[PDB]
Amino acid sequence: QISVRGLAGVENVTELKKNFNRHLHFTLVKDRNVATPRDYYFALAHTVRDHLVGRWIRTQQHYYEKDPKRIYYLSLEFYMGRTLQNTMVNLALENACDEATYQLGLDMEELEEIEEDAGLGNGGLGRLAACFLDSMATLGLAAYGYGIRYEFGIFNQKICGGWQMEEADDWLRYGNPWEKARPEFTLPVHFYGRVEHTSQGAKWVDTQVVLAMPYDTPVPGYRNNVVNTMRLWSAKAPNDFNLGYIQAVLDRNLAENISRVLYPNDNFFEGKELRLKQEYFVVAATLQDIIRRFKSSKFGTNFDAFPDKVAIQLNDTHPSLAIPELMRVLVDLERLDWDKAWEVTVKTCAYTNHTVLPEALERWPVHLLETLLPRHLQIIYEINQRFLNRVAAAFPGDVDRLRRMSLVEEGAVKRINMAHLCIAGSHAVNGVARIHSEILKKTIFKDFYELEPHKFQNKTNGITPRRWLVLCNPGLAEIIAERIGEEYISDLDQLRKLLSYVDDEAFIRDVAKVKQENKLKFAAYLEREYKVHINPNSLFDVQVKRIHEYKRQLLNCLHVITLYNRIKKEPNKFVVPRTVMIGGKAAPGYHMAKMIIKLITAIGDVVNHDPVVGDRLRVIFLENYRVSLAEKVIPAADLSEQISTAGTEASGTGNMKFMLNGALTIGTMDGANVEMAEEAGEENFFIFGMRVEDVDRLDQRGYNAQEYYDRIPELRQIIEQLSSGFFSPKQPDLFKDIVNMLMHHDRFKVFADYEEYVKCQERVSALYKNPREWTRMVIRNIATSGKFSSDRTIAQYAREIWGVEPSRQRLPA
Amino acid sequence: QISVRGLAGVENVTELKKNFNRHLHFTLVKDRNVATPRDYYFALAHTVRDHLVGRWIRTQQHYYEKDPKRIYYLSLEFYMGRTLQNTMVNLALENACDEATYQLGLDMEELEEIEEDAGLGNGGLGRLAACFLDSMATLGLAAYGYGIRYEFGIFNQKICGGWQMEEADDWLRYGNPWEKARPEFTLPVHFYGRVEHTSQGAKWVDTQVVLAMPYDTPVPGYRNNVVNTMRLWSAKAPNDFNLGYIQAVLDRNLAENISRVLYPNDNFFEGKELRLKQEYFVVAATLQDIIRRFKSSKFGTNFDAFPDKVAIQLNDTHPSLAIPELMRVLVDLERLDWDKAWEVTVKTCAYTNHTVLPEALERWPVHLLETLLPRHLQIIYEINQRFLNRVAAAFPGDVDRLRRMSLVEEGAVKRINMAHLCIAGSHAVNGVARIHSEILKKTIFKDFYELEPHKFQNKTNGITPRRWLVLCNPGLAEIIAERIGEEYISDLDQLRKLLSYVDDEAFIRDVAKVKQENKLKFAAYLEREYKVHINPNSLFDVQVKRIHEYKRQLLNCLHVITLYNRIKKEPNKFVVPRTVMIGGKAAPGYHMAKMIIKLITAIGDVVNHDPVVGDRLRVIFLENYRVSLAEKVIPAADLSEQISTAGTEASGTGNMKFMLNGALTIGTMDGANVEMAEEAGEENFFIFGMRVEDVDRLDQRGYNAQEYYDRIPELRQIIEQLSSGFFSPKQPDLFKDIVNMLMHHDRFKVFADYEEYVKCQERVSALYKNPREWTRMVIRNIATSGKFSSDRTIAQYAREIWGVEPSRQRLPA
Ligand SMILES: CC1(C)C=C[C@]2(C(=O)O)CC[C@]3(C)C(=CC[C@@H]4[C@@]5(C)C[C@@H](O)[C@H](O)C(C)(C)[C@@H]5CC[C@]43C)[C@@H]2C1
Numbered sequence A, B: 001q002i003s004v005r006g007l008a009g010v011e012n013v014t015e016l017k018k019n020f021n022r023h024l025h026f027t028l029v030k031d032r033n034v035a036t037p038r039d040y041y042f043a044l045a046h047t048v049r050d051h052l053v054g055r056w057i058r059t060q061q062h063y064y065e066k067d068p069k070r071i072y073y074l075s076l077e078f079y080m081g082r083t084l085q086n087t088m089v090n091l092a093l094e095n096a097c098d099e100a101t102y103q104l105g106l107d108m109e110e111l112e113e114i115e116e117d118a119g120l121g122n123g124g125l126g127r128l129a130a131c132f133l134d135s136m137a138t139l140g141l142a143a144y145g146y147g148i149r150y151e152f153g154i155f156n157q158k159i160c161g162g163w164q165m166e167e168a169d170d171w172l173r174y175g176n177p178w179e180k181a182r183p184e185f186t187l188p189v190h191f192y193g194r195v196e197h198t199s200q201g202a203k204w205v206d207t208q209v210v211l212a213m214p215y216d217t218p219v220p221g222y223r224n225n226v227v228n229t230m231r232l233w234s235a236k237a238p239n240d241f242n243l244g245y246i247q248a249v250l251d252r253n254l255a256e257n258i259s260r261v262l263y264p265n266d267n268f269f270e271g272k273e274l275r276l277k278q279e280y281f282v283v284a285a286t287l288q289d290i291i292r293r294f295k296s297s298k299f300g301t302n303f304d305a306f307p308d309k310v311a312i313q314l315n316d317t318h319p320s321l322a323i324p325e326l327m328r329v330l331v332d333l334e335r336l337d338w339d340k341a342w343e344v345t346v347k348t349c350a351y352t353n354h355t356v357l358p359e360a361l362e363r364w365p366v367h368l369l370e371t372l373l374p375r376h377l378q379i380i381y382e383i384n385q386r387f388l389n390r391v392a393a394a395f396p397g398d399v400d401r402l403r404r405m406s407l408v409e410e411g412a413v414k415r416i417n418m419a420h421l422c423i424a425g426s427h428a429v430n431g432v433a434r435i436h437s438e439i440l441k442k443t444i445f446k447d448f449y450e451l452e453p454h455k456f457q458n459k460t461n462g463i464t465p466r467r468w469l470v471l472c473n474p475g476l477a478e479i480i481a482e483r484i485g486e487e488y489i490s491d492l493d494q495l496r497k498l499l500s501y502v503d504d505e506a507f508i509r510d511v512a513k514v515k516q517e518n519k520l521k522f523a524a525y526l527e528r529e530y531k532v533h534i535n536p537n538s539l540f541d542v543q544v545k546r547i548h549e550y551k552r553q554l555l556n557c558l559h560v561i562t563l564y565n566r567i568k569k570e571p572n573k574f575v576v577p578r579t580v581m582i583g584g585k586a587a588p589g590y591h592m593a594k595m596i597i598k599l600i601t602a603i604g605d606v607v608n609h610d611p612v613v614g615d616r617l618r619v620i621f622l623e624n625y626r627v628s629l630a631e632k633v634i635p636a637a638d639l640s641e642q643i644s645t646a647g648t649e650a651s652g653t654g655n656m657k658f659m660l661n662g663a664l665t666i667g668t669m670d671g672a673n674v675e676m677a678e679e680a681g682e683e684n685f686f687i688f689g690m691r692v693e694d695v696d697r698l699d700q701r702g703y704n705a706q707e708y709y710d711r712i713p714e715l716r717q718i719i720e721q722l723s724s725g726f727f728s729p730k731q732p733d734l735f736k737d738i739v740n741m742l743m744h745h746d747r748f749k750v751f752a753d754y755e756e757y758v759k760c761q762e763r764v765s766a767l768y769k770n771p772r773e774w775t776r777m778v779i780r781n782i783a784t785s786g787k788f789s790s791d792r793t794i795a796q797y798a799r800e801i802w803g804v805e806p807s808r809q810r811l812p813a
């Protein structure tokens, strides 16, 4: 049908159709008279999965022969989304299967919509991992994704009377065609017990055993025949478990709870024991697998070559226990002396920090570690002690530095700072955008940077152009391909060539037309699936991301109410019509975040039913935001909101998704926004609000919100409406908490940016009135988004941290 | 290789080999360099399963077209054992796959040994169900097996210092290739709640919902292309379950515990709530499925035809709740009047009693039923009341009859007698052997028989000749086939033709040779898998079945000790050498049964290491007795022990397995022993001990064990040895409980049969000295075992209870 989707070549179409029928019959045990669309999905899924395995086997074959350095990406989250289309695309099968399914009387797109999201993550951190795996495969790196196979992913969000309800994401109900259970490689993991000292050294004894069973999922590279592995561990009870009888068998559930459910906190730390167990579980199983693989390799007892053969990347502090666990194995099991083991550990591990928010930082209570992991606690003390000896030696007399740098935090309950552990035990520590990396150096890890400056790097985040362009936006990918060819899909810098088309009249019409189709398509998705009626000619103003105070959905809310109040004030004035879409999940415990969601719908309730407004203003809350909903809403977006207070959003990746897809960005000078504007030029970006410097200036002086309430009558009016019950007529004081927080304890200075934000929003409206100039700015954005490809990011990790060469070369089919 | 295993025909062998390689590669994602025997097993398993599905689909197709009466076999137990060989045999694939696997360099027999037993039963009751399913398929009946898919079957038995240890039977670890999950047909099951009365009638409200997910396993007929279904329900939590958040997700385990584990009691009732839940769970899910299927059928709102289209067979009282549940649906949901519903229910249900032991009878406490199933309790009272009105009317004034017959038992805690429910609500009640059926009529259900004599029948149990001859004993099947052909495999009465070979010299040599090969093979299994050394020229004296007081493993123990004491008394006298093998599992709580096991090994410890004994006497305890171990030990057996006290073993099925396989039987006139001896003639059977009449005579008089201790010096000596610590030198009084029970509270009169048993054992030894005459008696046994085929049994159920015609006709391939 369209060029980028591949060859639909007769002999391949025939082979596909017959394998579809073979799976329908033998695998699913059905026929055409009974098969539901779900059965049809599975037949396709199994048929496509078939094409993977041959390559999967020869890829792992290759790595065995060549024995290259191996990359191990440890993450507690892998937000994969759907796998079918991504697989077809990466294999060049997309038009073949479209033809095959057409000739069978099936609509492939209808089938695609049946697949559950692998929602094994919360937001940015988890999706980054997913993007990374794709880029690592595409660059032919010998890489593995290691995590946990949660039985329940991020909860499904339902809105009831404008309130969020969580329900279990039972994503495995119908089965996962993509995974292969590998029970034969199950590994023991130990908990509790105590430490015994001998002449032979320390011994960890009297432990409970939980078994860790791996599941492998194939990770296909883009058209290169590389298929890497994502290995996810599942928790199983041993067979002599507790072994009156009935109860013994039922209590097996306690061990298996470890891998039951993903913790649903985005950028927030809850010190629960179950969470610590998940963390040790993934770390212990993964390290044995790594060591096992290292010994059984075509090479040469000798752990000196270990850092030459192994890289372990820590995705935030969640797998930080890899560090003391590696020491434990090296020292206690393999009998290496402390100092050699430590050199091996440091040269093996690297750490990626994802946030500077204090409440997101993992600080584990000592007493928890003492009970659960007594040996690791000892190792931690020993690590800490030796480290402080290095600090004392470099900065003699500096006693305050000593306590500031300690891995052990004093106070009512002693804590272990896991970020500090990671810095001390890694050869590389990186931020996820230039500004965030600088903030690490200048503020929260200043002490560590002074000690070991050579350890600190930047790796600006990226996204994958396969999922985030070719897959979710075939129309835009096609029109780009018509002009510049196809090579940009694995080399996105080539989008610069599109600058020489900024004045081309046909291309302008094409860009604007693709946007309009996406908007029509999404407006139709809203109708059929949620019975909501939007005008597709309005500006699509969207903020999608996890609900959080720092992300400032509230700032958006205030602008929305302002537009509403202006319309009501002068009903017959012309205003550029908008559809404001806000979506995202709140963590179950986060009360404030739940209130914000309630507000947004409360606003929608007043605004969407005011006849005076007409179709000039609509406020819609997007239920159950997740990867596969991002794939739909992002292509449809005109305005992207990235309005976090400066200094709080480490990078952001959504921002990049909207850039790649023809939305213009309204944002603060925060995270990767700074680099995005730098790439596109500040004239092609709606930048407003305080810079990092302005925030600090405001903090020393002290932030008084009352001041803004006093001087801005439009703001005073909104605050009065909130308090008086305008948006909650039955519960007049429903929103007292929000007003109270805004006035007296607002850590994120919503008011300080209000004026500059509303004015900047007027500038956006101005540009949208001139369709041609909007689209030319859009072209300037899309054409300079090259830098934000995860291929670039990964190539940087590969060369500057792991020491391996990215290859773009095919493997034989 | 051997004739009965089918055609190994070139084109089929080629097709098999290529499908093996396809599964190894695509399904298992392996290759020849990494594949372990387990992977090889799975490749075979998937390859064989492929041949089933085509037939499975056209079988269910056929039943849809023809719409015959459907048989629903409800059981809480289906003791299936292994499925691979049974599948190959029933499909005529056995030599083809042997050839195919040979040409691939694999030993098929080694592969077969990798398959786990489906140990979803305890003993006789569960294996009967398995035999039945095979016979029902073989006779082309439109039949379904309905039960629970337990995550853990009967525990694996380990012996540690001669004591039984239970460990979890984790039979699903590597997956079950045979089942197909059918999540799309999940059904709601309700618990707790309360009853609300309206004008519209009763309403069951405020219930907890547990979901029931079906798994289908194919049941192939013998060479007839019929493939029936066994549907097993699995327990799943609903998605709004409890829906702080984490705990809500973890508590989903509570709902799913229902299908977690099989209760390990053979012939014993434990009134636990979890057990009641399993019982209602299988009953509720199964009845909705039945009703659903009935409405969606090529026929015609109208439940009058229900008994013409549906038969529900209750396997013991465990699914007895089918009766009030059917009423509930009919009355409360479909709005039929009580009397019509009741007529429909009675004509639909039939009940099979499996034991007369009082402690095996299900009597549920009212308060449990009130909380868990309040509506069913009401229905039960209403059933009871109307029934007692029929009793009062037929026997006016008989007030004691009234209370004796009540479904409701008075006393400290009120109970519901489920056997009484089953009798009242079924059109047919059957015992499982002629004597047991008579006992039902004359004693425990005498009152019910007087009221409705037409309701009581016999259906003597049977076993399947496919598993129990062709599969476990190919050598014996072959030599029979040489003489009389193959038709006997689905018409076992034809074994009578073998009587005209009782004097044939070649056949005698063949029978004795097959026995000798089986004995050599089993002696080799003992060495390699358990390092135990047996003389294969000795008499193989075996008692395998669940450990129980009534089964009288103790009587055997006493004979064993007697033989030992006689040898020791006259060391240089000749004695016919024996290997005594005893095996079977004890229920975890049953303390006595565990002591018996300990004794047997304690005896082995003294006897097996006495140099004076030599290899004349060996006592071996067979660890982990289960279906696949029965398949090995039974063909190897010379003497079969069926020595339960008369009146206690309802039928027995092991007895029949040994008869079919060339063992002679030493037994009491109990259960099916009576019919076996009748078929073979009492001269061809070692019958000893009290008859039923003699037991009753002893009971009125009163059973004084002291009397036998006083008059039999050989018995006194054994009791002194037990007490003095002869078999437990470190723990002199270890066996006080057994001696004490034997002397003062022996319900099973072990001593009363001792004299007659030992003397009869001498007669067996006498015959074994004459190899030729042994084998001729063996031939007389094997040749008259026709009656004990489950095909006969099922044909009797079909014609006399269900009203359907067994067919032997093929369906097209
Ligand atoms: C070290 C062990 C025991 C545990 C972990 C393993 C791993 O690396 O993941 C498990 C998987 C295998 C068996 C493993 C190694 C190589 C094969 C291989 C690539 C071998 C190749 O000959 C074979 O031709 C193929 C089939 C390509 C295999 C694939 C499987 C692996 C990678 C290890 C085995």
Ligand SMILES: CC1(C)C=C[C@]2(C(=O)O)CC[C@]3(C)C(=CC[C@@H]4[C@@]5(C)C[C@@H](O)[C@H](O)C(C)(C)[C@@H]5CC[C@]43C)[C@@H]2C1
Pocket (backbone or CB within 6 Å): A030, A031, A033, A034, B057, B058, B060, B061, B064, B185, B292, B293, B296
């Ligand atoms: C009543 C329903 C909704 C629930 C229970 C069912 C049952 O009888 O087990 C579920 C299974 C199906 C769909 C069922 C009926 C027929 C098919 C069929 C035999 C139909 C035939 O055309 C089809 O050609 C085949 C494929 C032969 C099917 C097989 C499956 C069944 C038996 C019912 C469906």
